[PDB]
Amino acid sequence: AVHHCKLVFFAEAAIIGLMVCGVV
Amino acid sequence: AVHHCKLVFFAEAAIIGLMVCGVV
Ligand SMILES: [Cl-]
């Protein structure tokens, strides 16, 4: 099975990049 | 830098695991 990742951004005041990965 | 990751779960049954990584 394959891993998928994507960048998600959060406002904290900079904007923080976060990597979100799941197994599709 | 160093990546800090953690498991997050959405109990929706069927539980959806995801991994979230930010960089320090
Ligand atoms: Cl974190």
A10 CB-near residues (< 8 Å, 6+ apart)? A16, A18
Nearest CB among A18, A21, A22 relative to B22 is that of: A18
Contact B8, B20 (CB under 8 A): yes
Angstrom CA distances, B11 to B1, B8, B15, stand at 32, 10, 4
Nearest CA in chain A to B6: A20
- If you write DSSP's letter for every residue of B1-24 in order, what string do you get? --EEEEEEEEE---EEEEEEEEE-
- Backbone phi, psi, residue B14, to 5°: -145, 120
How is residue B1 written in tokens? 């830098």
B11 CB-near residues (< 8 Å, 6+ apart)? none
Q: How was this structure determined?
A: X-ray
- Residue B13 CA, ligand 1 centroid: distance in Å: 27
Angstrom CA distances, B17 to A8, A13, A22, B9, B20, stand at 16, 29, 7, 5, 10
Nearest to B24 by CA among A19, A1, A11: A19
Nearest CA in chain A to B20: A20
